[PDB]
Design a protein around this nucleic acid. Structure first.
Ligand code: NA
Ligand code: NA
Length: 329
DNA sequence: CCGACATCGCATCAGC
DNA sequence: GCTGATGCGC
DNA sequence: GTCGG
Protein backbone atom coordinates (compact mmCIF):
# COMPACT_ATOMS: atom_id res chain seq x y z
CA UNK A 1 0.00 0.00 0.00
CA UNK A 2 1.10 3.56 -0.82
CA UNK A 3 3.35 5.14 1.79
CA UNK A 4 1.39 8.38 1.39
CA UNK A 5 -1.51 6.83 3.36
CA UNK A 6 0.12 6.73 6.80
CA UNK A 7 3.77 7.33 5.92
CA UNK A 8 3.87 10.27 8.25
CA UNK A 9 2.85 7.98 11.11
CA UNK A 10 5.10 5.08 10.19
CA UNK A 11 8.13 7.39 9.87
CA UNK A 12 7.25 8.87 13.25
CA UNK A 13 7.20 5.42 14.82
CA UNK A 14 10.39 4.34 13.10
CA UNK A 15 12.26 7.45 14.21
CA UNK A 16 11.07 6.81 17.76
CA UNK A 17 12.14 3.20 17.33
CA UNK A 18 15.72 4.14 16.46
CA UNK A 19 16.04 6.47 19.45
CA UNK A 20 14.91 3.79 21.89
CA UNK A 21 17.40 1.41 20.28
CA UNK A 22 20.42 3.75 20.01
CA UNK A 23 19.93 6.30 22.82
CA UNK A 24 17.70 4.89 25.58
CA UNK A 25 19.16 1.41 25.05
CA UNK A 26 15.63 -0.03 25.10
CA UNK A 27 15.62 -2.82 22.52
CA UNK A 28 12.14 -4.05 23.50
CA UNK A 29 10.64 -0.58 23.03
CA UNK A 30 12.56 -0.59 19.76
CA UNK A 31 10.79 -3.71 18.52
CA UNK A 32 7.51 -2.45 19.99
CA UNK A 33 7.72 0.67 17.83
CA UNK A 34 8.76 -1.33 14.77
CA UNK A 35 5.97 -3.83 15.21
CA UNK A 36 3.51 -0.89 15.41
CA UNK A 37 5.00 0.93 12.42
CA UNK A 38 4.91 -2.32 10.51
CA UNK A 39 1.27 -3.24 11.17
CA UNK A 40 0.42 0.39 10.41
CA UNK A 41 2.24 0.20 7.07
CA UNK A 42 0.05 -2.77 6.12
CA UNK A 43 -3.32 -1.21 7.04
CA UNK A 44 -4.95 -0.25 3.68
CA UNK A 45 -6.71 2.80 5.13
CA UNK A 46 -5.69 6.35 5.95
CA UNK A 47 -5.81 6.40 9.75
CA UNK A 48 -8.02 9.22 11.11
CA UNK A 49 -7.63 8.68 14.82
CA UNK A 50 -5.36 6.90 17.25
CA UNK A 51 -8.34 4.87 18.44
CA UNK A 52 -8.68 3.50 14.93
CA UNK A 53 -5.02 2.50 14.97
CA UNK A 54 -5.34 1.22 18.53
CA UNK A 55 -7.49 -1.54 17.10
CA UNK A 56 -4.43 -2.91 15.31
CA UNK A 57 -2.24 -5.49 17.13
CA UNK A 58 0.91 -3.73 18.33
CA UNK A 59 -0.68 -0.31 18.92
CA UNK A 60 -1.51 0.59 22.51
CA UNK A 61 -2.60 3.58 24.55
CA UNK A 62 0.67 5.48 24.20
CA UNK A 63 1.09 5.13 20.44
CA UNK A 64 -2.60 5.78 19.77
CA UNK A 65 -2.06 8.94 21.78
CA UNK A 66 1.04 9.96 19.84
CA UNK A 67 -0.79 9.23 16.56
CA UNK A 68 -3.54 11.65 17.60
CA UNK A 69 -1.11 14.49 18.32
CA UNK A 70 0.56 13.92 14.98
CA UNK A 71 -2.71 14.01 13.05
CA UNK A 72 -3.79 17.22 14.76
CA UNK A 73 -0.52 19.20 14.53
CA UNK A 74 1.66 17.62 11.86
CA UNK A 75 4.40 16.49 14.24
CA UNK A 76 5.35 15.37 17.75
CA UNK A 77 6.82 17.59 20.49
CA UNK A 78 8.92 14.82 22.11
CA UNK A 79 10.30 13.99 18.68
CA UNK A 80 11.06 17.58 17.65
CA UNK A 81 12.88 18.01 20.94
CA UNK A 82 14.93 14.86 20.36
CA UNK A 83 16.04 15.97 16.87
CA UNK A 84 17.33 19.32 18.12
CA UNK A 85 19.16 17.44 20.88
CA UNK A 86 22.93 17.53 20.38
CA UNK A 87 24.06 14.29 22.01
CA UNK A 88 21.01 12.22 21.16
CA UNK A 89 21.32 13.05 17.48
CA UNK A 90 25.07 12.45 17.53
CA UNK A 91 24.63 9.17 19.36
CA UNK A 92 21.91 8.06 16.92
CA UNK A 93 24.07 8.96 13.96
CA UNK A 94 27.17 7.17 15.19
CA UNK A 95 25.33 3.83 15.42
CA UNK A 96 24.93 3.80 11.65
CA UNK A 97 28.54 2.66 11.65
CA UNK A 98 28.76 -1.14 11.78
CA UNK A 99 30.61 -2.02 14.97
CA UNK A 100 29.24 0.94 16.90
CA UNK A 101 26.19 -0.03 18.89
CA UNK A 102 24.41 2.10 21.53
CA UNK A 103 27.21 1.68 24.07
CA UNK A 104 30.24 2.56 21.91
CA UNK A 105 28.29 5.49 20.43
CA UNK A 106 27.41 6.61 23.92
CA UNK A 107 31.11 6.48 24.82
CA UNK A 108 32.31 8.37 21.74
CA UNK A 109 29.84 11.19 22.19
CA UNK A 110 30.90 11.43 25.83
CA UNK A 111 34.55 12.12 25.04
CA UNK A 112 33.55 14.55 22.32
CA UNK A 113 33.65 12.25 19.29
CA UNK A 114 30.43 13.08 17.40
CA UNK A 115 31.02 12.85 13.65
CA UNK A 116 32.46 10.47 11.05
CA UNK A 117 35.28 12.97 10.92
CA UNK A 118 35.91 12.71 14.64
CA UNK A 119 36.23 8.94 14.32
CA UNK A 120 38.51 9.20 11.28
CA UNK A 121 40.78 11.28 13.59
CA UNK A 122 40.64 8.86 16.53
CA UNK A 123 41.30 5.66 14.61
CA UNK A 124 43.11 4.02 17.50
CA UNK A 125 40.02 4.26 19.73
CA UNK A 126 38.09 2.11 17.27
CA UNK A 127 38.31 -1.69 17.27
CA UNK A 128 39.00 -3.68 14.09
CA UNK A 129 35.33 -4.10 13.27
CA UNK A 130 34.49 -0.43 13.73
CA UNK A 131 37.32 0.75 11.46
CA UNK A 132 35.88 -1.39 8.69
CA UNK A 133 32.38 -0.08 9.26
CA UNK A 134 33.84 3.40 9.11
CA UNK A 135 35.83 2.61 5.98
CA UNK A 136 32.64 1.48 4.25
CA UNK A 137 30.16 3.71 6.01
CA UNK A 138 28.58 4.67 2.70
CA UNK A 139 28.72 1.29 0.95
CA UNK A 140 27.08 -0.53 3.84
CA UNK A 141 24.01 1.74 3.57
CA UNK A 142 23.38 0.84 -0.09
CA UNK A 143 21.27 -2.10 -1.18
CA UNK A 144 22.17 -5.00 -3.47
CA UNK A 145 20.15 -5.45 -6.66
CA UNK A 146 19.13 -9.05 -7.37
CA UNK A 147 21.28 -9.32 -10.52
CA UNK A 148 24.22 -8.19 -8.44
CA UNK A 149 23.35 -10.85 -5.86
CA UNK A 150 23.23 -13.46 -8.62
CA UNK A 151 26.69 -12.45 -9.83
CA UNK A 152 27.77 -12.58 -6.20
CA UNK A 153 26.11 -16.00 -5.87
CA UNK A 154 27.75 -17.44 -8.99
CA UNK A 155 31.13 -16.66 -7.43
CA UNK A 156 30.32 -18.23 -4.06
CA UNK A 157 28.94 -21.48 -5.53
CA UNK A 158 31.79 -21.72 -8.01
CA UNK A 159 34.58 -21.25 -5.45
CA UNK A 160 33.00 -23.50 -2.82
CA UNK A 161 32.62 -26.36 -5.30
CA UNK A 162 36.26 -25.70 -6.26
CA UNK A 163 37.37 -26.30 -2.69
CA UNK A 164 35.37 -29.52 -2.34
CA UNK A 165 32.60 -30.96 -4.58
CA UNK A 166 30.63 -32.15 -1.55
CA UNK A 167 30.13 -28.74 0.00
CA UNK A 168 26.53 -27.54 -0.17
CA UNK A 169 26.07 -23.78 -0.18
CA UNK A 170 22.72 -22.00 -0.13
CA UNK A 171 22.29 -18.23 -0.27
CA UNK A 172 19.29 -17.74 1.99
CA UNK A 173 17.72 -14.54 3.21
CA UNK A 174 15.17 -12.40 1.37
CA UNK A 175 17.23 -13.24 -1.72
CA UNK A 176 16.16 -16.87 -1.70
CA UNK A 177 12.56 -15.69 -1.40
CA UNK A 178 13.06 -13.90 -4.71
CA UNK A 179 13.53 -10.37 -3.38
CA UNK A 180 14.60 -7.63 -5.82
CA UNK A 181 17.21 -6.14 -3.51
CA UNK A 182 19.13 -7.11 -0.40
CA UNK A 183 21.18 -5.51 2.37
CA UNK A 184 23.55 -8.46 2.66
CA UNK A 185 24.34 -12.01 1.52
CA UNK A 186 23.80 -14.89 3.92
CA UNK A 187 25.42 -18.11 2.74
CA UNK A 188 24.70 -21.33 4.61
CA UNK A 189 27.31 -24.03 4.20
CA UNK A 190 27.62 -27.73 5.09
CA UNK A 191 29.81 -30.73 4.29
CA UNK A 192 28.92 -34.40 4.71
CA UNK A 193 31.86 -34.89 7.11
CA UNK A 194 30.47 -32.27 9.49
CA UNK A 195 27.63 -33.59 11.66
CA UNK A 196 26.37 -32.87 15.19
CA UNK A 197 28.48 -35.66 16.72
CA UNK A 198 31.49 -35.40 14.42
CA UNK A 199 34.53 -33.14 14.03
CA UNK A 200 34.38 -29.46 13.06
CA UNK A 201 37.70 -29.84 11.20
CA UNK A 202 38.34 -26.08 11.87
CA UNK A 203 39.14 -25.42 8.20
CA UNK A 204 36.00 -26.59 6.44
CA UNK A 205 34.93 -23.00 6.98
CA UNK A 206 38.48 -21.66 6.93
CA UNK A 207 39.28 -23.27 3.57
CA UNK A 208 36.23 -21.62 2.03
CA UNK A 209 36.79 -18.11 3.37
CA UNK A 210 40.42 -18.59 2.39
CA UNK A 211 39.40 -19.61 -1.13
CA UNK A 212 37.16 -16.57 -1.50
CA UNK A 213 40.02 -14.35 -0.38
CA UNK A 214 42.33 -15.93 -3.02
CA UNK A 215 40.08 -14.98 -5.97
CA UNK A 216 39.80 -11.64 -4.20
CA UNK A 217 36.04 -11.77 -3.56
CA UNK A 218 36.19 -11.40 0.23
CA UNK A 219 38.04 -8.18 1.06
CA UNK A 220 37.77 -7.80 4.85
CA UNK A 221 37.01 -9.87 7.97
CA UNK A 222 34.76 -8.67 10.84
CA UNK A 223 34.73 -11.96 12.75
CA UNK A 224 35.62 -15.56 11.97
CA UNK A 225 35.21 -18.73 13.97
CA UNK A 226 34.87 -22.41 13.19
CA UNK A 227 31.19 -22.05 12.23
CA UNK A 228 30.47 -18.40 11.54
CA UNK A 229 32.23 -15.91 9.32
CA UNK A 230 31.25 -12.28 9.00
CA UNK A 231 33.06 -10.03 6.60
CA UNK A 232 32.98 -7.88 3.49
CA UNK A 233 33.10 -8.77 -0.21
CA UNK A 234 33.14 -7.13 -3.64
CA UNK A 235 32.37 -8.01 -7.26
CA UNK A 236 35.09 -7.69 -9.88
CA UNK A 237 34.70 -4.35 -11.66
CA UNK A 238 34.00 -4.42 -15.39
CA UNK A 239 37.18 -2.74 -16.68
CA UNK A 240 37.25 1.03 -16.23
CA UNK A 241 33.69 1.18 -14.93
CA UNK A 242 32.40 2.38 -11.57
CA UNK A 243 33.55 -0.53 -9.40
CA UNK A 244 30.89 -2.26 -7.30
CA UNK A 245 30.54 -1.08 -3.69
CA UNK A 246 31.79 -3.33 -0.89
CA UNK A 247 29.14 -5.68 0.51
CA UNK A 248 28.39 -7.47 3.76
CA UNK A 249 28.53 -11.25 3.61
CA UNK A 250 27.99 -13.86 6.31
CA UNK A 251 28.85 -17.53 6.00
CA UNK A 252 27.50 -20.28 8.24
CA UNK A 253 28.89 -23.79 8.59
CA UNK A 254 26.04 -25.91 9.94
CA UNK A 255 25.95 -29.72 10.56
CA UNK A 256 24.50 -31.78 7.66
CA UNK A 257 21.74 -33.20 9.89
CA UNK A 258 20.71 -29.65 10.86
CA UNK A 259 21.49 -28.07 7.51
CA UNK A 260 18.01 -27.98 6.08
CA UNK A 261 16.55 -26.81 9.38
CA UNK A 262 19.08 -24.03 8.99
CA UNK A 263 18.08 -23.24 5.41
CA UNK A 264 14.41 -23.14 6.42
CA UNK A 265 15.01 -20.65 9.23
CA UNK A 266 17.32 -18.28 7.36
CA UNK A 267 15.08 -18.13 4.31
CA UNK A 268 12.12 -17.07 6.43
CA UNK A 269 10.36 -14.83 6.19
CA UNK A 270 10.07 -13.93 9.87
CA UNK A 271 6.29 -14.25 9.63
CA UNK A 272 6.50 -17.58 7.82
CA UNK A 273 8.63 -19.00 10.62
CA UNK A 274 5.98 -18.04 13.16
CA UNK A 275 3.18 -19.75 11.23
CA UNK A 276 5.27 -22.93 11.13
CA UNK A 277 6.32 -22.74 14.79
CA UNK A 278 2.67 -22.21 15.67
CA UNK A 279 1.46 -24.94 13.31
CA UNK A 280 4.28 -27.42 13.99
CA UNK A 281 3.43 -27.55 17.69
CA UNK A 282 -0.30 -28.17 17.31
CA UNK A 283 0.74 -31.12 15.17
CA UNK A 284 2.94 -32.29 18.05
CA UNK A 285 6.38 -31.08 16.95
CA UNK A 286 8.88 -28.49 18.17
CA UNK A 287 10.75 -26.59 15.46
CA UNK A 288 13.80 -24.45 16.24
CA UNK A 289 16.57 -23.16 13.94
CA UNK A 290 18.49 -26.41 14.40
CA UNK A 291 15.99 -29.23 14.58
CA UNK A 292 12.45 -30.57 14.66
CA UNK A 293 11.51 -32.79 17.59
CA UNK A 294 8.39 -34.71 18.66
CA UNK A 295 6.53 -33.56 21.78
CA UNK A 296 5.31 -36.33 24.08
CA UNK A 297 1.92 -36.21 25.80
CA UNK A 298 3.55 -34.58 28.84
CA UNK A 299 5.11 -31.82 26.74
CA UNK A 300 8.51 -33.52 26.85
CA UNK A 301 10.39 -33.00 23.59
CA UNK A 302 12.10 -36.12 22.28
CA UNK A 303 15.05 -36.81 20.01
CA UNK A 304 15.60 -34.71 16.86
CA UNK A 305 13.73 -36.08 13.84
CA UNK A 306 15.91 -36.99 10.83
CA UNK A 307 15.98 -34.42 8.01
CA UNK A 308 17.55 -34.75 4.56
CA UNK A 309 15.71 -31.94 2.80
CA UNK A 310 13.44 -28.95 3.45
CA UNK A 311 10.34 -30.89 2.37
CA UNK A 312 11.04 -33.51 5.04
CA UNK A 313 10.27 -30.81 7.62
CA UNK A 314 7.02 -29.88 5.90
CA UNK A 315 6.05 -33.58 5.72
CA UNK A 316 6.54 -34.04 9.48
CA UNK A 317 3.95 -31.37 10.24
CA UNK A 318 1.22 -32.28 7.74
CA UNK A 319 1.96 -29.21 5.61
CA UNK A 320 2.60 -29.22 1.86
CA UNK A 321 5.94 -27.85 0.71
CA UNK A 322 6.08 -24.18 -0.22
CA UNK A 323 8.63 -22.54 -2.50
CA UNK A 324 10.71 -19.86 -0.75
CA UNK A 325 8.77 -17.37 -2.92
CA UNK A 326 5.48 -18.00 -1.13
CA UNK A 327 7.07 -17.89 2.32
CA UNK A 328 6.48 -14.17 2.80
CA UNK A 329 4.32 -15.28 5.74
C1' DC B 1 0.87 -5.79 38.44
C1' DC B 2 4.48 -7.40 36.29
C1' DG B 3 7.50 -10.51 33.11
C1' DA B 4 8.26 -11.74 27.99
C1' DC B 5 9.53 -9.76 24.11
C1' DA B 6 14.53 -14.19 19.15
C1' DT B 7 18.49 -15.91 18.34
C1' DC B 8 23.53 -16.88 19.22
C1' DG B 9 28.72 -16.98 17.37
C1' DC B 10 32.49 -14.30 17.87
C1' DA B 11 35.59 -10.20 19.60
C1' DT B 12 36.67 -8.21 23.47
C1' DC B 13 36.11 -6.22 28.02
C1' DA B 14 36.29 -7.28 33.24
C1' DG B 15 37.65 -9.93 36.72
C1' DC B 16 40.16 -13.38 39.26
C1' DG C 1 46.80 -17.21 31.91
C1' DC C 2 41.85 -18.37 32.45
C1' DT C 3 36.55 -17.82 32.51
C1' DG C 4 32.38 -15.20 32.54
C1' DA C 5 29.91 -10.77 31.06
C1' DT C 6 29.02 -7.55 27.71
C1' DG C 7 28.48 -5.58 23.12
C1' DC C 8 27.51 -6.31 18.48
C1' DG C 9 25.16 -7.63 14.10
C1' DC C 10 21.72 -10.90 12.67
C1' DG D 1 5.42 0.00 24.59
C1' DT D 2 2.42 -3.78 24.03
C1' DC D 3 0.46 -7.82 25.19
C1' DG D 4 -1.32 -11.09 28.30
C1' DG D 5 -0.85 -14.57 32.37
NA1 NA E 1 -3.83 -2.40 19.74
NA1 NA F 1 26.16 0.17 14.36
Amino acid sequence: PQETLNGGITDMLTELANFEKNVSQAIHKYNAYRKAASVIAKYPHKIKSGAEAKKLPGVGTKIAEKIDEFLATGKLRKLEKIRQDDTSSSINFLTRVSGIGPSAARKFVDEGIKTLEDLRKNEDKLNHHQRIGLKYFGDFEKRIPREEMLQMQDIVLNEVKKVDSEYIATVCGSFRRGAESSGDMDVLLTHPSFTSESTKQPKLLHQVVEQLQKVHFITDTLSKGETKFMGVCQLPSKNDEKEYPHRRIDIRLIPKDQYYCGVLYFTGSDIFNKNMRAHALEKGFTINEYTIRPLGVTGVAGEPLPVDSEKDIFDYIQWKYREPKDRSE
